[PDB]
Amino acid sequence: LKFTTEIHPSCVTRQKVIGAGEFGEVYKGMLKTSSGKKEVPVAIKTLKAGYTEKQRVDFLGEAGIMGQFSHHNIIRLEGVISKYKPMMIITEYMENGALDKFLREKDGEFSVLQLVGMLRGIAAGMKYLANMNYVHRDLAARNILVNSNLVCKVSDFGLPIRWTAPEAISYRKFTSASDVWSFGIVMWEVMTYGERPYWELSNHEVMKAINDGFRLPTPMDCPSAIYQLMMQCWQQERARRPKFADIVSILDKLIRAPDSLKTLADFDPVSIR
């Protein structure tokens, strides 16, 4: 297993709170590295006093998982503070935060090519994860982070019906192929600027629609090839779904011949006459 750096508390400064929970908080801060020669912005997640053994195992387990990975589209672990309390996980700082929230605050502002490029990055991260024999099980735009350069990184590895493939819902059969289903939902989240999958439907109503063969309709301004790809991610029979390598390849081919993205899937209308 790859080595997780134990960071000395004197090397970490917390500057601003960016989120809080029952278990602890997430801060923006700075990390001194390379034995004082380098300083980088970081995110810092804490586990505050009173945490249980299960909470510790999950908390440091996520750091141990993250530390195994070295990929452009996976959040980088700087290290952990475990010898002192409160314990901390320290990652690179992603300036634009969670992808779903980011897109909802930037509705309509990106090009189709930019959105497809975000999906290519997420797909490359997922291909890496799956190849490393990791199943994410909770892939959703809320677990993707975005930096100032619009690079998207798979970010939350702690482990939600409407992102989950039918065989994972009904049989707990979580695999890379059920992650591919989830990726298809993420494609829809991105192309809609963070719409809620299935809108007002309840979890039971989503299960009803999907098992009857219903699938999410096309986003507005969505290339036909992109809608076709997310539909293939939602094949009921998992063996018929693309592998992440197929997804990355298809997205690459579309980006390299961008006029291919100008053929749009029909956005089915509300009658205004």
Ligand SMILES: Cc1cccc(Cl)c1NC(=O)c1cnc(Nc2cccc(C(=O)NCC(C)(C)CN)c2)s1
């Ligand atoms: C530290 C850590 C441990 C385990 C797992 C992970 Cl993924 C992390 N790292 C992080 O959670 C984060 C890394 N980068 C983050 N950036 C972030 C998250 C949420 C909000 C913002 C942010 O600054 N958003 C802009 C707004 C609009 C909220 C104004 N500040 C930025 S959060």
